[PDB]
Amino acid sequence: GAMGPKSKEELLREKLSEDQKTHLDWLKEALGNDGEFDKFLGYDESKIKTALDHIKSELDKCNGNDADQQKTTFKQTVQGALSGGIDGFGSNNAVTTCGNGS
């Protein structure tokens, strides 16, 4: 966790939707490290909001018995999705196999 005053996560928080605020915390939990989540906060808002909204979409695609688990596993997927950038982040690398399970 970060120490001090409100950080980028808090300053971007205001401009984001209540949805996106929730997924910020979710993403942070995923990444674990503040330094990694900071990297996400330093992206274009036009990319950040879409990234968060996409995460929301996949997470919304998982509501059932093992949803809790897949929501947790998705954290690991997103980490390795934003690892090379937020530019190519979408249904081409980050997806929930919850409603698309094969």
From Swiss-Prot:
Compartment(s) of residence: Cell outer membrane
Membrane topology listed for this record: Lipid-anchor
Gene Ontology cellular component annotations, sorted alphabetically: cell outer membrane
Alphabetic keyword roster: Cell outer membrane, Lipoprotein, Membrane, Palmitate, Plasmid, Signal
Induction entry: Strongly induced when grown at 35 degrees Celsius.
Major subcellular location class: membrane
Stated family: Belongs to the Multicopy lipoprotein (Mlp) family.
Role summary: An outer membrane protein that may participate in pathogenesis. Some human Lyme disease patients have antibodies against this protein. The Mlp proteins probably undergo intragenic recombination, generating new alleles.
Name this protein carries in UniProt: Lipoprotein MlpA
